[model samples]
Target: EVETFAFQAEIAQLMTLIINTFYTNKEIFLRELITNTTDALDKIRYETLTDPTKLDTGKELHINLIPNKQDRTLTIVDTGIGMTKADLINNLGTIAKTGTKAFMEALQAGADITMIGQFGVGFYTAYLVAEKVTVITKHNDDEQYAWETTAGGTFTVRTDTGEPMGRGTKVILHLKEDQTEYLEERRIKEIVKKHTQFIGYPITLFVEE
Candidate 1:
């Protein structure tokens, strides 16, 4: 999710390693992502105490599951603390195994952003189910940014004039040839119950009957 998609050969090499790991079921990817969304919501809920206006006023915090069988796309949306331009360029790049926020500390101030292509290798796990990924989010301070990647190791971020998200993030995963199970209503429900029932917030799954 790091926005440093300019790594060239370095990134390509980094992804080469990740795609070769003992990757497990792609169903678990949704579990990991939902867990991340809950963390974002909780972060804002905590920050609101220190700065009330820090939140995008009255934005309901919820996740939406929109699946498109025709185009073979599954979108996961979260009305959480969105990222800024810097957040996209920095956090979007790979980091450590310590989770999203922990990966922030791993990125030292003034360090070469390119050096990060080598840090977060497992972040490529998303590619397990998606052939391409696109992120559309509107931050409180940012207009709108889109981060797109095919997991070739490099990700690209660009100013987007597309549909607005107000203050949240939407991740679109283009399901791979064999990963279509991720879009099945029954399959998603089963995974949610098995791996995400204990999460704090709602895990809403939207699929066609």
Candidate 2:
């Protein structure tokens, strides 16, 4: 059932700390995002083994990077479980979701949290380098939704009008002036290898000549 929840005032402060100071290395953004993609691929691959129909969509479980030098935009596309509109609002808007809060509480309790898992704030890392971020996502069970945000408090979620992929999600980062390093193929490749070389799924880059 769909439900409504409000954000505590502390969430904004937490988000600000995350966006401004959490990541020491900006290139890790690619690594973190690809890691998530690999996890999704793992999930679907397991499902496909049980139900052959899952493979009918003919989508490859891979990550693709498309950089547009002219527009200073870098897009990372992955074949994964795309999110729904509610996901956009709840997942993207707030930082105190159950998973995140639990992770934090674990840390505070000084529990053995090495495997505590990510707090689902990796997506916000894009805002650390991009002026705008656009997520084009199509889920297996629902219509496509595009979520856009400029790292500010407000964001927009709308029905996607573009051609939908069989299954998965794409995140396009509109690079800011200081983030142009991601626009370079060599840089992106190195970052991916450093962070995601051992990822179970294959990752590729499509560079425009």
Candidate 3:
């Protein structure tokens, strides 16, 4: 079974603003997701180097992208630090409290702001182009869970019924009509290089013919 959590009013407002205004290009979603995956891989690499046993069961650390032209679905899967049920609610359902507060404070302070992921708001970027999103996640410490949302006010989380991935997460984006550019391999690669070329982890793209 999976537990649930609701987004605070501020988070909901922030999400709406981002989806409606902040991002100008749909291609950036790949970069954001890849950057996040890179961060996760970096965390695992740091931990594994210090305590190798932590990786005994899930050593495969890589990012995979599968694009389905027919269904207009893009799946970005990563073998990184997966989220537990509580994490699904806390991490995915809402923005980081500290980061959110800091971001707001920075804006109020008139600080030059160029980043968005730092506030744990990066994941919501998926909604800019996707009508629906499904996150299949499995943390080493908790049972696998699937979180689904339409970018609307409500979201649902339930125990994942698929074969258990030993560890990590997969995010499937059901692209909206206007966001079809994301389904192109050239577009995906271009975005990745532009935004996440310096990111630490290896990124691979899998396309369906």
Candidate 4:
């Protein structure tokens, strides 16, 4: 069964503020996503330490960046703890809803928007570069689910029956026409080198010849 959720009113306003405020440093979107994947890697690693069986999905943890020029899409895949449907609905949907109030007040009062990440709203920054975003994830205890949105007030979550992704999450960002620079292999490599060199897990980018 597919489920849909609408953004709480303030969440929409917050999205606009974030995009306008950080447009110049748009590349921060990639940094935010890479950091998120590493956090997922850390969680799964810790979980498996106590319950070894959690690694049943094959435990080589890593992240892969796939940029498809033909499709104009940049996909980030990670072998980490994926989310269940509830986790998807709650984590992706609710994080921004609750924090919007505080974020708005801070902005109106002249606080720097740099504190936006502190609200755990970094994931929405995906919209900074993408026209649409799709997340497909498989968790150790749940079936795979796909979450898709155009950031158009509502998002849909449905049971995924696509490729055989073992255990983790894949975030596909359908890059906006003008934002296609991210599709370049060199750009991705430079970003990874500068921001994610010290990440504990290996981050490999697919090289298209």
Query: lDDT winner among the candidates?
Result: 4
Clashes (candidate 4) = 0
Instruction: Point out the worst 10-residue segment of candidate 3 by lDDT.
Output: 107-116
Of candidates 4 and 1, the better by lDDT? 4
Write model 1 residue lDDT over 11-109, tens digit each, in one string: 454445445544455565676667667766777778888988867544487877788888899888988787777766664533433332333344435
| Worst ten in a row by lDDT for model 2 | 1-10
Please, what is the TM-score per model? Answer: 0.78, 0.81, 0.86, 0.91
Error of 2 at 140 (Å): 1.3
Give the Cα lDDT of each candidate.
0.67, 0.70, 0.76, 0.83
The parts of candidate 1 lying over 4 Å away from their true place are 1-4, 8-14, 20-24, 93-123
Better of 2 and 4 by lDDT: 4
Q: How close is candidate 2 to the true structure, as a TM-score?
A: 0.81
For 1-209, candidate 3 gives per-residue lDDT tens digits of 65555666665665565566654655656777887777777776777888898787588889998999898999988888777888788856344665656665665676323355666667767877898989998877788899987755667899999978888889999998988889899988888878877876668888676
The CA-based lDDT of model 1 is what?
Answer: 0.67
Cα lDDT tens digits, model 2, 1-209, are 22233444344444454467544467766776677677777767888888877766655788888999999999888887666677667764334466556655665676432322366556655666787888888767678878776654556778888886788888889988978989898998788877777987768788788
- Number of clashes found in candidate 3: 0
The CA-based lDDT of model 3 is what?
A: 0.76
